[PDB]
Swiss-Prot record:
Subunit structure and binding partners: Interacts with CTNNB1 (when unphosphorylated), perhaps preventing interaction of CTNNB1 with TCF4, and thereby regulating transcription activation; phosphorylation of CTNNB1 may inhibit the interaction.
Protein name: FLYWCH-type zinc finger-containing protein 1
Localisation: Nucleus; Chromosome, Centromere
Function per UniProt: Transcription cofactor. Negatively regulates transcription activation by catenin beta-1 CTNNB1, perhaps acting by competing with TCF4 for CTNNB1 binding. May play a role in DNA-damage response signaling. Binds specifically to DNA sequences at peri-centromeric chromatin loci.
Gene from which the chain derives: FLYWCH1
Annotated source species: Homo sapiens (Human)
Entry superkingdom: Eukaryota
Induction: Up-regulated by ultraviolet (UV) light (at protein level).
Zinc fingers, FLYWCH-type class: 13-71
Amino acid sequence: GSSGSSGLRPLEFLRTSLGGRFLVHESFLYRKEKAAGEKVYWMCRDQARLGCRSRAITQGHRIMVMRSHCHQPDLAGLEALRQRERL
Ligand SMILES: [Zn+2]
């Protein structure tokens, strides 16, 4: 569990096989689309499956959300993706 109040909040990430690294935010999963040098654009990995166009921006140790999500988070599926990472 993670509970606390601070201006600069941390951020979680993930690493998958040939494809790049994932981003954990709002109990969801995103993929690094592009990088503006100092900024890194992401997109809900469920953009091809759940037709989710929800994008976000990561900077330093924080994160940002552009659009919303048309689907619900699956703590069950998200954890199954972290296991293959912590091993
Ligand atoms: Zn989404």
